[PDB]
C-alpha cells in the first residue's frame, strides 16, 4: 500500500531510505526492483532523518531510481496453524511443497515474549535415549534444552537421527499409568549443505516421522541472513504446538554456528564493538532469546525440549560460541575425536558432558534407587583410569602396581562396552546391568560414593 | 547505458558519480581505455566500482559507462583445449595481437568467433522447448557437446536449420516467439545453473592415487580439501590429479599462483594420454590461471567463472572435476577489497561474510540430474593454503564444516621426503559408509573388512610408536616389533606413490586391494610363526620383502601373474622354518 | 526341520503382510477420496454467502 | 496412508479456497465496470486522500478522473490521469518518496490472510 522511495545508500546487507517517518520499528518490508522481483526485509533503526533496512536475500540487481520499499507487520509475524505437519519451509517459512500455504488459526509475534518463570514448573520426566551415556551419567529429561556439541566431522547428524527415531519417555516406571505419546519433531536447520539435508529427510521417511515433524530448512546455498530469522520462527511454532495442543515437542535447531556466524555478519556491517573473537556483544541476549523459550508450563501438558546442535570451531570449550552457550543452556553433551578413532559410536566422551537437572530427573521409584550413586561412581572411577593413562604413558606399562591395572582394565572395558555400541536401543535395566558388569572389575572399598545396600545387592 | 564521470580513484577503486540507477554487480567499462570493473555500495548517485585490473595512471573525470547486464561468461562450444585469465578471455589469444605480456585494457573475445563448427540437429519445428532441453549436436574433440536450451527460454519451435557448419554465434534455432538461439548463450557467474533434482553420492571418484581411495576416498558429486603448508608439495598432487582420474572435463581454476604450474601443465600435457580416450590430455582440461603477479581483483571472477563452467559441462552428461587452487588468495582478495572499502574486520582481516561466500561456492558441487533427462555430477577439490599449520584460521575453520574429505598434508613428513604427505590420521572422509556396496560390487567381495584390517593396523602401529620412542626398542615383547615392521612395510611399500615413475603416477583400484590383500596375508601368516618361536630379526630379510617391497612398479597387463606367485611364496616362505 | 519352519513363517509372514498393506492402502485411499469428494461438496453446499462478506470487508 | 488421506483433504479444502479467491477476483474484476463504481470510485478516493498525509499527487484511470473530479477540485491535489490504475488509485507525497495505493486487488492481496483465517472456519461449515 504506502510504498516509500528514496533509497540513498546500499551495501552488503544494509540500504538507507529516507523521509521514512511511518515505518515502525523492526517491521517488514518487501523490496520491489525494476523487473517484478520482491525480496524480505527488517528494519532496525528509525528516524524521522532516515532508516535501515536489512535485506533477507541477496542485494543484486538494485538501482536507485526504482526499488521502493513496501512495508507488511509492525513487528514481524508469523501466521499459525496446525495444518502444518507435512509441509517444509524455507529460511522465512514460505512453504517449498507445491501446496498452499497454511490457513492461519492464529497470528504470532516470531521474536517471542519472555517466560515467565513463576509460570513454568520443574522438569520432573525422564526420557530415554537409549544411548546408555545419556540415559546412565547425564539424564535428558523432559523440558531441558541440551546442546550436542561436535568437533570438526563427529557424527552428530547421527546422534540427533537416533535420538529422533528411538527416544521416548518411559510412563510406567514413572508411576501415572499411562498415555505414551510419541514425539513431534520441530527440525530447523540452518545451512546444512545438502548431504546432511538428505540423510536427515531419508531418515525420517525411513521411521515414519514426516507425518508428525515440520522442516524450517535455510539450507548452504540460501540467502545468509535469514538464517536469524529461522530459529525464532520455528520456536514460535514449538511454544504453539507445545502450549495449545498439549505436546511432547522435541526441537532439533541444527548447526547454531551458522546462526552465529551470521549474527557475526549483521553486527559487523553496523559497525558494532565486538566482544571476543570478533563476535558482538549481544549475542548473549540472542541466543537467550533463542533458547529459553523452552521448558515446561505449570499445569498444561505440552512440553518443549531441544537439541541444539553445535559446531566447536578448534573443537575447545573455550571458544565464545560453545562458552557462551554452556553459560546460558543447562546441561549438554560433548563428542571428542580421541574416542572417534578407535570406532567407538556414538563418540561421546563422559567426563565434559553434564546434565545440569539428573538430580530432579531420577531417583527413588522414578528410575532407579541406585542411579545417582552408580552415575558418581563411574564418573570417579573412570576420571581417575584416564589421568592414570598419561602417567602410565609417562612411565611405562612394567612400572605399575596394584588397582593400576584394574583402573586401566577398567578404563578400555567401558570405553568399549558402555559407550561402543551399534544402533540398538538399550534401556535403563539394561544399561545399569551393563553398569555392572562394568563395576565387577573393581575389588571393593574403593566403591566409596555407592552405599552398603547397592553394593550388596548388585555386585557380579 | 547510463554514463557518468570518475569522482574519486583510491587504489583499486573507481568510485564514479552520476550514476542515479546503475543496479548491482554491473560490469561497467570504466575509463576510457575500456577497462572492466563490477559495481557495489550503491551511494546518492554514485557508485563504487572496482576494476579487475590495475588502474595506475587514470585521472579524474574520464567516462564511466554501465552495461547495464550484470558479470556474465559466454558458455558454448570450443571451451576445451584452452587457458582463459579471471575475466575469461584466453590468453592465447593476446600472445597474438599483443606479444609475451599481458597490457592494460585489451577488448577481445571470450571464445574464437570465427571457428566453423558442424551442427546436427536434434528437434524437429513445432516443438516445444523449456530450459536445459536438448536442442543440437556438435563433435569437439573426442566429443558430441550438446547445446542446450538456456534455462530461462520457453516456447514453441519455429524454425531450425540443417546439418552444415556455422560461426559459433549463428542464429540456428528461432523460435515462434520471436526468439533466436545462438549456438552460446550468457550466464552470471553467481548463479547456479538449476536442476530437476539433486541426488546422492554413491559412486567414488575415483581419484586414482594409491591413499586418496584406499583410506579416504571421495565421491563423485563430494568436496574434498586439502590443506598443507609450502615444502608439503601440494602442486604435485593438484597436476597428478589433473594427470590420472576418472573425469570427463577437468576445470583447474589456478588462483594466487606460480607461473612455472601454469606453463608446466600446458606444456607437459599435450603429449600425455587420458585412460579412456586416446590422443592428448589437454582435449579435457579447461584451465583458468591466474598468476600471482595479475591484478587482485580478478581472482574473485576466476573462481566462479570456473564453476559455471563446470555446471555448464555437468548439464552435457559429463562427471566434471574442478580443482579450485590456493582459495587463500581468493580470501586475501576478499580481504584486500573489505580493507579498501572500510568495514568491520573479523578474525584477522577476513570480513565476516567469507563463510557465506565460501559456503555458496562449495555447495554448486554435487550430483544431480539435469532438466535433460541426463545424469551429472561434479566434484570440487579445494586447495586450501593455511600460514603454517595453525589450523584455527577462519579459512580453514571455515572449509571444514562444508567439506565431504579433509586431507591433511602434514609437513614432518614431507621432511624425509615421503610424497604424499597424507597424515594418517586427523585426515577423515565421510563417504565411507555409503561406497560400500559399489567397492563390495566393483574392487573386491572382502574390500571393505580388507582396509578396516587396514585402517586398525594403522591406528595400533600409531598409537604402539609413541612408548617405541620413549622407553626405546629395546623392550620390544615380541609382537611389537612385527606391529613397527608391517608399519615400515606400508609406509615405505605401499604409501610411496612417485608420480613421476610412469606406472606408478597412477594406479588401480585392483592393484591397490592386491597390495593390500598381500600385506595381510603377510602379516596373518607371519604372526602364525611368531608364537612359534622364530626371531623377530630373522624373519625381515626373506626374500618375498623385496618381492612386495617393489612390487608396486608393475602395470595391470604384469600384475596378476606376479600377483599370484608372490602370494605362493607368502605361503611357501614359511615352510622353510 | 527348523530351517525349513523358519523359512516356512518368513514367507508367510511376508505374504501377510503385502496382503495386510495393500489392504490398508486400498482403505485409506478410498477413504481419502471419499472425505475428499464430501468436502468438496460440503465447501460447495455452504459456498456463494461469504463471498459477499468478503466482497463487503474489501469494498469501501 | 493417514498422510495421503490428510494431503487429499488439504488440497481439497485449499481447492474450494481457490475456487472462492478466483469468485471474488471475478468481482473484483466486476467492480470496476458497474454502475455505482463511480461512486465507490469516489469514495475510495476520500478514503485515500484522508489516508495521504500532505502529499502532493494522486494519480487514477483517466475515465476514473471525472469520479471523483469534484473530490479532485477539492483539495488541491495534483490530480494525474494514469490509465495504467485500472484498480484504485497512487498518491506520490510532495518529495518523490513516498507512495500510497488503493487499489482493489492490493487490498484482496492485504487482507486474503484474513480472509483465510475467518472466512475458511466459516465456510467450512
Same mark, same amino acid.
Request: aromatic share 8%; glycine share 8%.
Given at each position: 500500500?504506502?510504498?516509500?522511495?528514496?533509497?540513498?545508500?546500499?551495501?552488503?546487507?544494509?540500504?538507507?531510505?529516507?523521509?521514512?517517518?511511518?515505518?515502525?520499528?523492526?517491521?517488514?518490508?518487501?523490496?520491489?526492483?525494476?523487473?517484478?522481483?520482491?525480496?524480505?526485509?527488517?528494519?532496525?533503526?528509525?528516524?524521522?532523518?532516515?532508516?535501515?533496512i536489512?535485506?533477507?536475500?541477496?542485494?543484486?540487481?538494485?538501482?536507485?531510481?526504482?526499488?521502493?520499499?513496501?512495508?507488511?507487520?509492525?513487528?514481524?509475524?508469523?501466521?499459525?496453524?496446525?495444518?502444518?505437519?507435512?509441509?517444509?519451509?524455507?529460511?522465512?517459512?514460505?512453504?517449498?511443497?507445491?501446496?498452499?500455504?497454511?490457513?492461519?488459526?492464529?497470528?504470532?509475534?516470531?521474536?517471542?515474549?519472555?517466560?515467565?518463570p513463576?509460570?513454568?514448573?520443574?522438569?520432573?520426566?525422564?526420557?530415554?535415549?537409549?544411548?546408555?551415556?545419556?540415559?546412565?551419567?547425564?539424564?535428558?529429561?523432559?523440558?531441558?534444552?541440551?546442546?550436542?556439541?561436535?568437533?570438526?566431522?563427529?557424527?552428530?547428524?547421527?546422534?540427533?537421527?537416533?535420538?529422533?527415531?528411538?527416544?521416548?519417555?518411559?510412563?510406567?516406571?514413572?508411576?501415572?499409568?499411562?498415555?505414551?505419546?510419541p514425539?513431534?519433531?520441530?527440525?530447523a536447520?540452518?545451512?546444512?549443505?545438502? $548431504? !546432511? =539435508?538428505?540423510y536427515?529427510?531419508?531418515?525420517?521417511?525411513?521411521?515414519?516421522?514426516? +507425518?508428525? %515433524?515440520? *522442516?524450517?530448512? @535455510?539450507?548452504?546455498?540460501d540467502?545468509?541472513?535469514?538464517?536469524?530469522?529461522?530459529?525464532?520462527?520455528?520456536?514460535?511454532?514449538?511454544?504453539?504446538?507445545?502450549?495449545?495442543?498439549?505436546?511432547?515437542?522435541?526441537?532439533?535447531?541444527?548447526?547454531?554456528?551458522?546462526?552465529?556466524?551470521?549474527?557475526?555478519?549483521?553486527?559487523?556491517?553496523?559497525?558494532?564493538?565486538?566482544?571476543?573473537?570478533?563476535?558482538?556483544?549481544?549475542?548473549?541476549?540472542?541466543?537467550?532469546?533463542?533458547?529459553?523459550?523452552?521448558?515446561?508450563?505449570?499445569?498444561?501438558?505440552?512440553?518443549?525440549?531441544?537439541?541444539?546442535?553445535?559446531?566447536?570451531?578448534?573443537?575447545?570449550?573455550?571458544?565464545?560460541?560453545?562458552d557462551?552457550?554452556g553459560?546460558?543452556?543447562?546441561?549438554?553433551?560433548?563428542?571428542? $575425536? !580421541? =574416542?572417534?578413532?578407535?570406532?567407538?559410536?556414538?563418540?561421546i566422551?563422559?567426563?565434559? +558432558?553434564? %546434565?545440569? *537437572?539428573?538430580? @530432579?530427573?531420577?531417583?527413588?521409584?522414578?528410575?532407579?534407587?541406585?542411579?545417582?550413586?552408580?552415575?558418581?561412581?563411574?564418573?570417579?572411577?573412570?576420571?581417575?583410569?584416564?589421568?592414570?593413562?598419561?602417567?602410565?604413558?609417562?612411565?611405562?606399562?612394567?612400572?605399575?602396581?596394584?588397582?593400576?591395572?584394574?583402573?586401566?582394565?577398567?578404563?578400555?572395558?567401558?570405553?568399549?562396552?558402555?559407550?561402543?555400541?551399534?544402533?540398538?536401543?538399550?534401556?535403563?535395566?539394561e544399561?545399569?546391568?551393563?553398569?555392572?558388569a562394568?563395576?565387577?572389575?573393581?575389588?571393593?572399598?574403593?566403591?566409596?560414593?555407592?552405599?552398603?545396600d547397592?553394593?550388596?545387592?548388585?555386585?557380579? | 547505458?547510463?554514463?557518468?564521470?570518475?569522482?574519486?580513484?583510491?587504489?583499486?577503486?573507481?568510485?564514479?558519480?552520476?550514476?542515479?540507477?546503475?543496479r548491482?554487480?554491473?560490469?561497467?567499462?570504466?575509463?576510457?581505455?575500456?577497462?572492466?570493473?563490477?559495481?557495489?555500495?550503491?551511494?546518492?548517485?554514485?557508485?563504487?566500482?572496482?576494476?579487475?585490473?590495475?588502474?595506475?595512471?587514470?585521472?579524474?573525470?574520464?567516462?564511466?559507462?554501465?552495461?547495464?547486464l550484470?558479470?556474465?561468461?559466454?558458455?558454448?562450444?570450443?571451451?576445451?583445449?584452452?587457458?582463459?585469465?579471471g575475466?575469461?578471455?584466453?590468453?592465447?589469444?593476446?600472445?597474438?595481437?599483443?606479444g609475451?605480456?599481458?597490457?592494460?585494457?585489451?577488448?577481445?573475445?571470450a571464445?574464437?568467433?570465427?571457428?566453423?563448427?558442424?551442427?546436427?540437429?536434434?528437434?524437429?519445428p513445432?516443438?516445444?522447448?523449456?530450459?536445459?532441453?536438448?536442442?543440437?549436436?556438435?563433435?569437439?574433440?573426442g566429443?558430441?557437446?550438446?547445446?542446450?536450451?538456456?534455462?530461462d527460454?520457453?516456447?514453441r519451435?519455429?524454425?531450425?536449420?540443417?546439418?552444415?557448419?556455422?560461426?559459433?554465434?549463428?542464429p540456428?534455432?528461432?523460435?515462434?516467439?520471436?526468439?533466436?538461439?545462438?549456438?552460446?548463450?550468457?550466464?552470471?557467474?553467481?548463479?547456479?545453473?538449476?536442476?530437476?533434482?539433486?541426488?546422492?553420492?554413491?559412486?567414488?571418484?575415483?581419484?586414482?592415487?594409491?591413499?586418496?581411495?584406499?583410506?579416504?576416498?571421495?565421491?563423485?558429486?563430494?568436496?574434498?580439501?586439502?590443506?598443507?603448508?609450502?615444502?608439503?608439495?601440494?602442486?604435485?598432487?593438484?597436476?597428478?590429479?589433473?594427470?590420472?582420474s576418472?573425469?570427463?572435463?577437468?576445470?583447474?581454476?589456478?588462483?594466487?599462483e606460480?607461473?612455472?604450474?601454469?606453463?608446466?601443465?600446458?606444456?607437459?600435457?599435450?603429449?600425455?594420454?587420458?585412460?579412456?580416450?586416446?590422443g592428448?590430455?589437454?582435449?579435457?582440461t579447461?584451465?583458468?590461471?591466474?598468476?600471482?603477479?595479475?591484478?587482485?581483483?580478478?581472482?574473485?571472477?576466476s573462481?566462479?567463472?570456473?564453476?559455471?563452467?563446470?555446471?555448464?559441462?555437468?548439464?552435457?552428461?559429463?562427471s566434471?572435476?574442478?580443482?579450485?587452487?590456493?582459495?587463500?588468495?581468493?580470501?586475501?582478495?576478499?580481504?584486500?577489497?573489505s580493507?579498501?572499502?572500510?568495514?568491520?574486520?573479523?578474525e584477522?582481516?577476513?570480513?565476516?561474510?567469507?563463510?557465506?561466500?565460501?559456503?555458496?561456492?562449495?555447495?554448486?558441487?554435487?550430483?544431480?540430474?539435469?532438466?535433460?533427462?541426463?545424469?551429472?555430477?561434479?566434484?570440487?577439490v579445494?586447495?586450501?593454503?593455511?600460514?603454517?599449520?595453525?589450523?584455527?584460521?577462519?579459512?580453514?575453520?571455515?572449509?571444514?564444516?562444508?567439506?565431504?574429505?579433509?586431507?591433511?598434508?602434514?609437513?614432518?613428513?614431507?621432511?624425509?621426503?615421503?610424497?604424499?604427505?597424507?597424515?594418517?590420521?586427523?585426515?577423515?572422509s565421510?563417504?565411507?559408509?555409503?561406497?560400500?556396496?559399489?567397492?563390495?560390487?566393483?574392487?573386491?567381495?572382502?574390500?571393505?573388512?580388507?582396509?578396516?584390517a587396514?585402517?586398525?593396523?594403522?591406528?595400533?602401529?600409531?598409537?604402539?610408536?609413541?612408548?617405541?620412542?620413549?622407553?626405546?626398542?629395546?623392550?620390544?615383547?615380541?609382537?611389537?616389533?612385527?606391529?613397527?615392521?608391517?608399519?615400515?612395510?606400508i609406509?615405505?611399500?605401499?604409501?610411496?606413490?612417485?608420480?613421476?615413475?610412469?606406472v606408478?603416477?597412477?594406479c588401480?583400484?585392483?592393484?591397490?586391494?592386491?597390495?593390500?590383500?598381500?600385506?595381510?596375508?603377510?602379516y596373518?601368516?607371519?604372526?602364525?610363526?611368531?608364537?612359534?618361536?622364530?626371531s623377530?630379526?630373522?624373519?625381515?630379510?626373506?626374500?618375498?620383502?623385496?618381492?612386495?617391497?617393489?612390487?608396486?612398479?608393475?602395470?595391470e597387463?604384469e600384475?596378476?601373474?606376479?600377483?599370484?606367485?608372490?602370494?605362493?611364496?607368502?605361503?611357501?616362505?614359511?615352510?622353510?622354518? | 526341520?527348523a530351517?525349513?519352519?523358519?523359512?516356512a513363517?518368513?514367507?508367510?509372514?511376508?505374504?501377510?503382510?503385502?496382503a495386510?498393506?495393500?489392504?490398508?492402502?486400498?482403505?485409506?485411499?478410498?477413504?481419502?477420496?471419499?472425505?475428499?469428494?464430501?468436502?468438496?461438496?460440503?465447501?460447495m453446499?455452504?459456498?456463494?454467502?461469504?463471498?459477499?462478506?468478503?466482497?463487503?470487508?474489501?469494498?469501501? | 496412508?493417514?498422510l495421503?488421506?490428510?494431503?487429499?483433504?488439504?488440497?481439497?479444502?485449499?481447492?474450494?479456497?481457490?475456487?472462492?479467491?478466483?469468485?471474488?477476483?471475478?468481482?473484483?474484476?466486476?467492480?470496476?465496470?458497474?454502475?455505482?463504481?463511480p461512486?465507490?470510485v469516489?469514495?475510495?478516493?476520500?478514503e485515500?486522500?484522508?489516508?495521504?498525509?500532505?502529499?502532493?499527487?494522486?494519480?487514477?484511470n483517466?475515465?476514473?478522473?471525472?469520479?471523483?473530479?469534484?473530490?479532485?477540485?477539492?483539495?488541491?491535489?495534483?490530480?494525474?490521469?494514469?490509465?495504467?490504475?485500472?484498480?484504485?488509485?497512487?498518491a506520490?507525497?510532495?518529495?518523490?518518496?513516498?507512495?500510497?495505493?488503493?487499489?482493489?486487488?492490493?487490498?484482496?492481496?492485504?487482507?486474503?490472510?484474513?480472509?483465510?483465517?475467518?472466512?475458511?472456519?466459516?465456510?467450512?461449515?
Open positions: 500500500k504506502k510504498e516509500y522511495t528514496g533509497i540513498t545508500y546500499i551495501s552488503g546487507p544494509l540500504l538507507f531510505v529516507e523521509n521514512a517517518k511511518d515505518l515502525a520499528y523492526g517491521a517488514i518490508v518487501d523490496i520491489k526492483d525494476g523487473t517484478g522481483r520482491v525480496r524480505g526485509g527488517q528494519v532496525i533503526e528509525v528516524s524521522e532523518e532516515y532508516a535501515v536489512q535485506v533477507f536475500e541477496e542485494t543484486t540487481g538494485l538501482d536507485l531510481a526504482t526499488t521502493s520499499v513496501s512495508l507488511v507487520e509492525d513487528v514481524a509475524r508469523l501466521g499459525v496453524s496446525k495444518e502444518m505437519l507435512g509441509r517444509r519451509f524455507n529460511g522465512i517459512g514460505k512453504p517449498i511443497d507445491g501446496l498452499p500455504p497454511i490457513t492461519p488459526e492464529k497470528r504470532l509475534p516470531i521474536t517471542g515474549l519472555p517466560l515467565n513463576v509460570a513454568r514448573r520443574k522438569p520432573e520426566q525422564f526420557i530415554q535415549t537409549g544411548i546408555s551415556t545419556i540415559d546412565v551419567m547425564n539424564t535428558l529429561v523432559r523440558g531441558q534444552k541440551l546442546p550436542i556439541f561436535s568437533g570438526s566431522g563427529l557424527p552428530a547428524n547421527e546422534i540427533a537421527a537416533q535420538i529422533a527415531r528411538q527416544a521416548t519417555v518411559r510412563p510406567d516406571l514413572s508411576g501415572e499409568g499411562e498415555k505414551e505419546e514425539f513431534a519433531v520441530v527440525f536447520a540452518m545451512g546444512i549443505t545438502q $548431504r !546432511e =539435508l538428505s536427515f529427510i531419508q531418515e525420517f521417511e525411513r521411521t515414519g516421522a514426516l +507425518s508428525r %515433524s515440520v *522442516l524450517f530448512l @535455510n539450507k548452504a546455498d540467502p545468509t541472513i535469514e538464517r536469524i530469522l529461522t530459529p525464532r520462527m520455528a520456536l514460535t511454532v514449538a511454544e504453539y504446538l507445545a502450549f495449545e495442543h498439549d505436546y511432547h515437542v522435541l526441537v532439533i535447531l541444527t548447526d547454531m554456528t551458522n546462526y552465529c556466524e551470521a549474527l557475526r555478519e549483521i553486527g559487523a556491517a553496523r559497525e558494532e564493538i565486538p566482544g571476543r573473537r570478533g563476535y558482538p556483544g549481544y549475542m548473549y541476549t540472542d541466543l537467550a532469546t533463542i533458547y529459553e523459550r523452552a521448558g515446561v508450563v505449570e499445569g498444561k501438558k505440552g512440553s518443549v525440549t531441544q537439541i541444539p546442535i553445535l559446531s566447536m570451531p578448534d573443537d575447545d570449550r573455550t571458544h565464545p560460541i560453545p557462551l552457550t553459560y546460558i543452556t543447562e546441561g549438554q553433551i560433548q563428542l571428542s $575425536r !580421541e =574416542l572417534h578413532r578407535k570406532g567407538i559410536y556414538p563418540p566422551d563422559p567426563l565434559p +558432558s553434564l %546434565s545440569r *537437572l539428573m538430580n @530432579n530427573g531420577v531417583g527413588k521409584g522414578k528410575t532407579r534407587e541406585d542411579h545417582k550413586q552408580v552415575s558418581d561412581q563411574l564418573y570417579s572411577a573412570y576420571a581417575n583410569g584416564v589421568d592414570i593413562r598419561k602417567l602410565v604413558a609417562i612411565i611405562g606399562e612394567d612400572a605399575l602396581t596394584e588397582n593400576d591395572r584394574r583402573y586401566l582394565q577398567f578404563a578400555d572395558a567401558f570405553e568399549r562396552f558402555f559407550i561402543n555400541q551399534g544402533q540398538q536401543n538399550r534401556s535403563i535395566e544399561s545399569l546391568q551393563i553398569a555392572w562394568l563395576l565387577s572389575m573393581l575389588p571393593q572399598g574403593e566403591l566409596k560414593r555407592i552405599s552398603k547397592h553394593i550388596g545387592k548388585y555386585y557380579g | 547505458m547510463i554514463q557518468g564521470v570518475i569522482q574519486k580513484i583510491a587504489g583499486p577503486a573507481v568510485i564514479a558519480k552520476g550514476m542515479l540507477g546503475a548491482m554487480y554491473d560490469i561497467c567499462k570504466v575509463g576510457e581505455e575500456g577497462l572492466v570493473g563490477e559495481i557495489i555500495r550503491l551511494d546518492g548517485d554514485t557508485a563504487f566500482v572496482q576494476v579487475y585490473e590495475d588502474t595506475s595512471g587514470l585521472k579524474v573525470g574520464e567516462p564511466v559507462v554501465s552495461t547495464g550484470p558479470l556474465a561468461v559466454e558458455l558454448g562450444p570450443g571451451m576445451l583445449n584452452g587457458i582463459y585469465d575475466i575469461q578471455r584466453p590468453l592465447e589469444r593476446i600472445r597474438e595481437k599483443t609475451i605480456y599481458i597490457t592494460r585494457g585489451v577488448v577481445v573475445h571464445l574464437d568467433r570465427e571457428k566453423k563448427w558442424a551442427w546436427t540437429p536434434m528437434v524437429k513445432g516443438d516445444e522447448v523449456r530450459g536445459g532441453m536438448v536442442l543440437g549436436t556438435v563433435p569437439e574433440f566429443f558430441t557437446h550438446k547445446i542446450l536450451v538456456p534455462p527460454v520457453r516456447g519451435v519455429k524454425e531450425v536449420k540443417p546439418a552444415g557448419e556455422y560461426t559459433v554465434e549463428e540456428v534455432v528461432v523460435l515462434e516467439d520471436g526468439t533466436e538461439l545462438k549456438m552460446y548463450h550468457t550466464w552470471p557467474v553467481r548463479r547456479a545453473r538449476p536442476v530437476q533434482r539433486k541426488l546422492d553420492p554413491n559412486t567414488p571418484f575415483l581419484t586414482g592415487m594409491r591413499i586418496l581411495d584406499v583410506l579416504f576416498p571421495v565421491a563423485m558429486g563430494g568436496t574434498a580439501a586439502i590443506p598443507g603448508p609450502f615444502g608439503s608439495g601440494k602442486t604435485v598432487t593438484q597436476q597428478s590429479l589433473a594427470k590420472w576418472n573425469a570427463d572435463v577437468v576445470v583447474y581454476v589456478g588462483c594466487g606460480r607461473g612455472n604450474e601454469m606453463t608446466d601443465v600446458l606444456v607437459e600435457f599435450p603429449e600425455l594420454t587420458d585412460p579412456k580416450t586416446g592428448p590430455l589437454m582435449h579435457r579447461v584451465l583458468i590461471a591466474n598468476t600471482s603477479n595479475m591484478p587482485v581483483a580478478a581472482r574473485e571472477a573462481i566462479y567463472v570456473g564453476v559455471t563452467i563446470a555446471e555448464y559441462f555437468r548439464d552435457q552428461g559429463f566434471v572435476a574442478l580443482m579450485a587452487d590456493s582459495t587463500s588468495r581468493w580470501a586475501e582478495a576478499l580481504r584486500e577489497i580493507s579498501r572499502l572500510e568495514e568491520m574486520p573479523a584477522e582481516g577476513y570480513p565476516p561474510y567469507l563463510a557465506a561466500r565460501l559456503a555458496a561456492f562449495y555447495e554448486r558441487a554435487g550430483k544431480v540430474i539435469t532438466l535433460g533427462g541426463e545424469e551429472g555430477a561434479v566434484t570440487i579445494g586447495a586450501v593454503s593455511p600460514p603454517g599449520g595453525d589450523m584455527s584460521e577462519p579459512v580453514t575453520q571455515s572449509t571444514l564444516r562444508i567439506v565431504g574429505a579433509f586431507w591433511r598434508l602434514d609437513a614432518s613428513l614431507a621432511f624425509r621426503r615421503h610424497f604424499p604427505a597424507i597424515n594418517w590420521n586427523g585426515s577423515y565421510l563417504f565411507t559408509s555409503a561406497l560400500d556396496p559399489w567397492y563390495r560390487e566393483n574392487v573386491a567381495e572382502d574390500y571393505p573388512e580388507l582396509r578396516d587396514i585402517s586398525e593396523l594403522l591406528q595400533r602401529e600409531a598409537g604402539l610408536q609413541e612408548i617405541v620412542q620413549l622407553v626405546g626398542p629395546d623392550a620390544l615383547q615380541d609382537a611389537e616389533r612385527l606391529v613397527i615392521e608391517v608399519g615400515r612395510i609406509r615405505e611399500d605401499f604409501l610411496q606413490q612417485n608420480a613421476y615413475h610412469e606408478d603416477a597412477y588401480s583400484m585392483k592393484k591397490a586391494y592386491g597390495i593390500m590383500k598381500m600385506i595381510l596375508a603377510f596373518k601368516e607371519a604372526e602364525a610363526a611368531i608364537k612359534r618361536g622364530v623377530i630379526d630373522e624373519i625381515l630379510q626373506l626374500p618375498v620383502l623385496e618381492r612386495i617391497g617393489r612390487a608396486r612398479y608393475v602395470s597387463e600384475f596378476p601373474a606376479y600377483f599370484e606367485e608372490a602370494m605362493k611364496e607368502i605361503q611357501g616362505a614359511f615352510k622353510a622354518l | 526341520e530351517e525349513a519352519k523358519a523359512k513363517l518368513e514367507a508367510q509372514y511376508r505374504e501377510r503382510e503385502r495386510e498393506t495393500e489392504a490398508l492402502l486400498a482403505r485409506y485411499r478410498e477413504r481419502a477420496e471419499a472425505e475428499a469428494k464430501a468436502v468438496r461438496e460440503k465447501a453446499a455452504r459456498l456463494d454467502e461469504a463471498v459477499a462478506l468478503v466482497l463487503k470487508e474489501v469494498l469501501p | 496412508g493417514e495421503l488421506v490428510a494431503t487429499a483433504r488439504t488440497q481439497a479444502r485449499g481447492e474450494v479456497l481457490e475456487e472462492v479467491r478466483r469468485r471474488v477476483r471475478e468481482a473484483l474484476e466486476a467492480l470496476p465496470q458497474k454502475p455505482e463504481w461512486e465507490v469516489r469514495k475510495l478516493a476520500l485515500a486522500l484522508e489516508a495521504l498525509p500532505g502529499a502532493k499527487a494522486l494519480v487514477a483517466p475515465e476514473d478522473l471525472p469520479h471523483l473530479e469534484a473530490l479532485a477540485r477539492e483539495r488541491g491535489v495534483e490530480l494525474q490521469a494514469e490509465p495504467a490504475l485500472r484498480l484504485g488509485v497512487r506520490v507525497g510532495a518529495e518523490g518518496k513516498t507512495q500510497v495505493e488503493n487499489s482493489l486487488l492490493a487490498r484482496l492481496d492485504r487482507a486474503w490472510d484474513a480472509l483465510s483465517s475467518k472466512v475458511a472456519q466459516a465456510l467450512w461449515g
